[PDB]
């Protein structure tokens, strides 16, 4: 009944289209939740999409001024993958930060809400409020904003608390049926570890995070699900994945330390490893969240100074808006497949013809077959959408 | 299959956020039922929210003048905790008063409707109309407006009939699979008993009610399920929980009798006991239903003249509107947890910029871990919503 992700990793030559929600296009006619910070997670049967909704729909008077991320009204919305966030959507907890697991028996939700300084993280398992934690650093307590990973019933959640421009305490929480059985403080070469995209690299969990201080490369957190021992490093590839970043001709990594290059304000993203090569995805624009491309860097997980790209794909066209992206793993028949989701942000703070901010999602999964080209933007026309 | 609630009570140091529905905020754009008098109850798998809907949606010409509580159109709506009362909501009985149990096998609904003088209470079990009762005092027959409790299949419902502000008759009905097997008249020191919040204090049921006659303290009804013997008293803590109530500096209790202080009206609320201490919740205000705070009074279940709080929480801010609140118990892995819900009322009878009255709900559950601070109001802006 429990899920141990024991199978190998599927052979990946690229990613194929899997899902699209068309949330903003449907919001023009119809009642659709205003969301942001989405992700995807699958129970052993099918896959679900999650988002942090601002407590209102888009054709709503309350949809104005929704660019803020921490309000008493944001909740965690869950549907099946594909069903748009209509008014029948079940909102499963009060949260302005969130993460979600399925251990093979029941869903686990980690939900952070409350005052910025003093905040509360509720751990909900099988429809019960099983546990709760308070801020340790008395700052904005926050978590992965994507799925967490369970192995043999022990789930792992990475939670950060503190300032970027300051001392940030990151902890890894080991949860069993909603109860926190252990808590390990982060240790290693990674100074900052925010918004981690974790995947089960059996026998452990590997997370690729964002650095918001002094880094355009991504941190790596290796959690031993068993000994509860944490290792930290940085993604070693010379083509770094954060944004803002440098221009590829002029870029670099350190494989241990931040690169100290355009390291000011990252974007959540993902990466994983195929042998020595690294499969990664990033925005096509190097400064704004415009476009989204995935590719493979040869010897990028074990050699800085590698800039051999391959199997490049353009998921979202370079002139179209993207945002947070993340990884989730799906148990196949004989191996473990890796999929990713991209959040396509639309609205205020970058397009001043509307008063709201919302997102759509586009989901791709790895494939051992062949694939073509394309581009799957959000498609909403904000110059007409109702005002 | 039956549910006995045999486990101990969970260690409670406070309450953590569990759910929020954002009904009024979504009603500005959407099809949400005009409700009031909500509650929460859980089958052994998940939790459900119930409400008494006025037979219309907020943006509907019929939302006009919905401050009345007894109309032929109010029905009992049941969704899954979190799903807002959209137009797909199943309305499970005709009722302007209601209560609901789950005995581990099927749902029980007690629904009161009819003319105020001569009224009928239908008892519906497993989707059948199993039983029915008429008013005994030929007055407004009414019930708990929250969940009832079943132990060994025998469920218990407290029903009052009689004077709004005078002596009234109260009975405790013992139901088995929808059939009323016994009926005990209330006996003890509690004079007026209404809108009870009951919880399984194994081996029996303990209910904390409201005194609408001569008290600002809450009555207590101890029902022993096996011998159908009823005991009545008052909540003994010096910090009384009904509203209207007197200042904390000058409030009193009797532990047997009404305090005769600001006891004219009241509000439905809850309280339970942790050893000698009492965990309770009330509105921060003592004359209006504004705000909501929960705390613990030390030796408050055994000693009057005790005004020693601890573990105070502010669930709803002092300047924001609250209403009915109630308790419901959730069976954990090794103990029984206590949760409460607060009804956030918005509209006519106070805010005269709209013609309707509706409510939202906010749900908290007890925790043995730590928690922070916050405030989770309704959040609707009625200056911009349709009248």
């Amino acid at each position, epitope marked *: 009944e429990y899920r141990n992700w024991s199978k190998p990793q599927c052979g990946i030559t690229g990613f194929a289209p899997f899902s699209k929600d068309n949330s903003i296009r449907l919001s023009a006619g119809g009642d659709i939740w205003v969301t942001r910070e989405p992700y995807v997670s699958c129970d052993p049967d099918k896959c679900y999409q999650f988002a942090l909704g601002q407590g209102t729909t888009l054709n709503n008077v309350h949809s104005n001024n929704t660019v803020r*991320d*921490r309000t008493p009204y944001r909740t965690l919305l869950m549907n099946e993958l594909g069903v748009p966030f209509h008014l029948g959507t079940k909102q499963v907890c009060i949260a302005w930060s969130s993460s979600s697991c399925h251990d093979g028996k029941a869903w686990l939700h980690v939900c952070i809400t409350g005052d910025d300084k003093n905040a509360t993280a509720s751990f909900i398992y099988n429809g019960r409020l099983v546990d709760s934690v308070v801020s340790w650093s008395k700052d904005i307590l*926050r978590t992965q904003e994507s799925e967490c990973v369970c192995i043999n019933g022990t789930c792992t959640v990475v939670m950060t608390d503190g300032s970027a*421009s300051g001392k940030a305490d990151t902890k890894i929480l080991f949860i069993e049926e909603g109860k926190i059985v252990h808590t390990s403080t982060l240790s290693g070469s990674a100074q900052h570890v925010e918004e981690c995209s974790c995947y089960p690299r059996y026998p452990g969990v590997r997370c690729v995070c964002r650095d918001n201080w002094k880094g355009s490369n991504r941190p790596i957190v290796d959690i031993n699900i068993k000994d509860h021992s944490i290792v930290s490093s940085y993604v070693c590839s010379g083509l770094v994945g954060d944004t803002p970043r440098k221009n590829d001709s002029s870029s670099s990594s350190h494989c241990l330390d931040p690169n100290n290059e355009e390291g000011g*304000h990252g974007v959540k993203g993902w990466a994983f490893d195929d042998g020595n090569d690294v499969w990664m995805g990033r925005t096509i624009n190097e400064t704004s969240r415009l476009g989204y491309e995935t590719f493979k860097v040869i010897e990028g997980w074990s050699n800085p100074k590698s800039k051999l790209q391959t199997n490049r794909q353009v998921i979202v066209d370079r002139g179209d808006r993207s945002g947070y992206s993340g990884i989730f793993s799906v148990e196949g028949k004989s191996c473990i497949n890796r999929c990713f989701y991209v959040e396509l942000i639309r609205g205020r703070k970058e397009e001043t013809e509307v008063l709201w901010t919302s997102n759509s999602i586009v989901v791709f999964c790895g494939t051992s077959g062949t694939y073509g080209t394309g581009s799957w933007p959000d498609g909403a026309d904000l110059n007409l959408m109702p005002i | 299959e039956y549910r006995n609630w045999s486990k101990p009570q969970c260690g409670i140091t406070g309450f953590a956020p569990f759910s929020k529905d954002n009904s009024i905020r979504l009603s500005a754009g959407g099809d949400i039922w005009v409700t009031r008098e909500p509650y929460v109850s859980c089958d052994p798998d998940k939790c459900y929210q119930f409400a008494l809907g006025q037979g219309t949606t907020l943006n509907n010409v019929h939302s006009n003048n919905t401050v009345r509580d007894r109309t032929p159109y109010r029905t009992l709506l049941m969704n899954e905790l979190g799903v807002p009362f959209h137009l797909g909501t199943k309305q499970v009985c005709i009722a302007w008063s209601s209560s609901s149990c789950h005995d581990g096998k099927a749902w029980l609904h007690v629904c009161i409707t009819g003319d105020d003088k001569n009224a009928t209470a239908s008892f519906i079990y497993n989707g059948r109309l199993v039983d029915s009762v008429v008013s005994w005092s030929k007055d407004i027959l009414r019930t708990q407006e929250s969940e009832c409790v079943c132990i060994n299949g025998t469920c218990t419902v407290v029903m009052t009939d009689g004077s709004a502000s005078g002596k009234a008759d109260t009975k405790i009905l013992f139901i088995e699979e929808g059939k009323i097997v016994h009926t005990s008249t209330l006996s003890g020191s509690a004079q007026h008993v209404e809108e009870c919040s009951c919880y399984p204090r194994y081996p029996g049921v303990r209910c904390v009610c409201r005194d609408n006659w001569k008290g600002s303290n809450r009555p207590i009804v101890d029902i022993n399920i096996k011998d159908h013997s009823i005991v009545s008293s008052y909540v003994c803590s010096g910090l009384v929980g009904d509203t209207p109530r007197k200042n904390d500096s000058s409030s009193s209790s009797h532990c047997l009798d009404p305090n005769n202080e600001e006891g004219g009206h009241g509000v439905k609320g809850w309280a339970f006991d942790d050893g000698n201490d009492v965990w309770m919740g009330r509105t921060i205000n003592e004359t209006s239903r504004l705000g909501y705070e929960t705390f613990k009074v030390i030796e408050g279940w055994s000693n009057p003249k005790s005004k020693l709080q601890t573990n105070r929480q502010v669930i709803v801010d002092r300047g924001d509107r609250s209403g009915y609140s109630g308790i419901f118990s959730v069976e954990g892995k090794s103990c029984i947890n206590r949760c409460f819900y607060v009804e956030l009322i918005r509209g006519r009878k106070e805010e005269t910029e709209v013609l309707w009255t509706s409510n939202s709900i906010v749900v908290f559950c007890g925790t043995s871990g730590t928690y922070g601070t916050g405030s989770w109001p309704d959040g609707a802006d009625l200056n911009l919503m349709p009248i």
Partner: antibody
Amino acid sequence: EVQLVESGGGLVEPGGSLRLSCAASGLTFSTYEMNWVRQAPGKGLEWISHISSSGFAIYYADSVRGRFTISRDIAKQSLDLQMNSLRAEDTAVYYCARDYYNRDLGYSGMDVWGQGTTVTVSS
Amino acid sequence: EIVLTQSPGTLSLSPGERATLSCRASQYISSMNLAWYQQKPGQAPRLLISAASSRATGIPDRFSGSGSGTDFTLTISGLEPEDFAVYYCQKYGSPYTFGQGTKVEIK
């Protein structure tokens, strides 16, 4: 039209006390962190005090620490600053301001400022 | 004391052109915490830029600040009659700190 409004400044002899009040509607003291920032006549803006969203964590600049307190009272959702043991160095145009810090975007900025209250400390 | 020096004492330029104002920090400050305000003498300081690149609502896309590391710059594509005002850096933190003040003048 209407937003954050501050008042309560006046001429006091040095060594006196004063209380400054900023009150605001919609641009609430419930949602944003608030900051008092002053400007000496023809000098650079100097931030003096910061109050969190819950009105618990309080920070003061070195210049005014120990003589000034920024506090909030529920009255009309408003915040005040109590100044005691004033000096001639405190003549300024005091400002109240609101800020937020996004965990994904960073400092929002003091988007909304008051009109300004003129304080001249002299004998 | 992370002292933000706004490097141009004054741009001192002729109207209808680009204006490039600077801002240098003592130590490496993350670009997230930095903002740019326009104080026209006599009125409240008006926000222009947040997070060192993000523009404020109601502010035209003409103003485009950038920078990183220790140094940041504010660039104005075209000066117009209103643009002539003092421009301040500001950095979130304990404590906040403003800049000494950069003016832009006619001719």
